[PDB]
Amino acid sequence: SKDFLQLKGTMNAFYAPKQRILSILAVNRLFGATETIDFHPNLLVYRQSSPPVRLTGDVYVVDKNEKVFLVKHVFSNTVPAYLLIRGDYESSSDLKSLRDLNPWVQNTLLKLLIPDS
């Protein structure tokens, strides 16, 4: 939909500007994208919060130094996915290793994170 744009080089990753959200479909492909946007760190705007914003469910650490996390999220219409967030966050439960994630999301994350030097 027009609410977001598919990230270049990804079949299951998109970004919603008005929401400032990067999302990765758990098991689903994107389709119909006539446009794509190059990934860039600015997209992961650091969320400011005097007390760390609490998070629930499955949480994974991407960059402890940069407060980057991956949060399991299901769209109310029951669409599984993960949200990549950067900011002052804390986890209600124990943080989980990324290896737990499926190869699909893992490949997308590698593409999005490792700079193409």
């Binding site: 400011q48 919060s49 005097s50 002052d88």
Partner: protein, 275 residues
């Protein structure tokens, strides 16, 4: 300005080592303590406190008391506050502390063999006779003077194991208290508050249950039974930048402390003795 800061009479006899001695000012207070607050905290996990008893007009009985610095998860050695002479060497990592501090501890526990061993080892320091022996003399004399001062036998009805309901029999915590040195006994008296205070046939109860435990291992911040009491505790950075400029706040707070409450103090016909 007598500095009673036992464990600050420590001199880094090693040239390469400098002892900061960053310890609490209260050592210059002519109190019943022979060890000031920071030494107490560091080496016994205790924080000095005072408990007023009568504070109406001028009767200002202010019994002293220290607080646990032990959480509700530590156990065994981690929980022991004042170890016995049989286990203090183990509880304290003497090897990790300066030999002068080790000497102080050995003197406190009357480990003359360890004292002799330490001075024998110091015998083989490069500047041994020059200044190592002078440091030995200074530290040893200071510690001995403090110990003699504490010891009452030199030149009253406080019972520490007599509070423990549900105990099978025996007490003997007072036995070990007797076995302790004068300095250790005075420290225990100064820091531990008897749960009961009887004056001329007048009993005051401060707690419904004692908080400390005394046994062969020594003084332990343990409970008489059940689980342990809950005991909680610029370099501008990017994170230090705050975001946009923009719940019982109105009520006072009861401390989440665990003061040393244990024992029964009996006072004879003597009235409200305030000297």
């Amino acid at each position: 300005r007598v500095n009673r800061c036992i464990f600050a009479s420590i001199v880094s006899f090693d040239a390469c080592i400098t002892y900061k001695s960053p310890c609490s000012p209260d050592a210059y207070h002519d109190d019943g303590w022979f060890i000031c607050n920071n030494h107490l905290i560091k080496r016994f996990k205790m924080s000095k406190m005072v408990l007023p008893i009568f504070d109406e007009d001028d009767n200002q009985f202010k019994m002293t008391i220290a607080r646990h610095l032990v959480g509700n998860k530590e156990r065994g050695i981690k929980r022991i506050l004042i170890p016995s002479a049989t286990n203090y060497q183990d509880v304290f990592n003497l090897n990790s502390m300066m030999q002068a501090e080790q000497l102080i501890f050995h003197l406190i526990y009357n480990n003359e063999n360890a004292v002799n061993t330490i001075c024998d080892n110091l015998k083989y320091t490069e500047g041994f006779t020059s200044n190592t022996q002078r440091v030995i003399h200074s530290v040893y004399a200071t510690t001995k003077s403090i110990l003699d001062t504490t010891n009452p036998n030199t030149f009253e009805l406080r019972f520490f194991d007599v509070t423990n309901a549900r105990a099978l029999r025996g007490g003997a915590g007072d036995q070990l208290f007797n076995n302790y040195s004068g300095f250790l006994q005075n420290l225990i008296r100064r820091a531990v508050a008897p749960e009961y205070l009887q004056i001329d046939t007048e009993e005051l109860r401060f707690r419904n249950c004692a908080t400390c435990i005394i046994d062969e291992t020594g003084l332990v911040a343990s409970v008489p039974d059940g689980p342990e009491l809950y005991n909680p505790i610029n370099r501008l950075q990017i994170r230090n930048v705050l975001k946009f400029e923009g719940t019982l706040s109105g009520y006072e707070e009861y401390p989440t402390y665990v003061p040393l409450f244990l024992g029964y103090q009996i006072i004879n016909s003597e009235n409200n003795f305030l000297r």
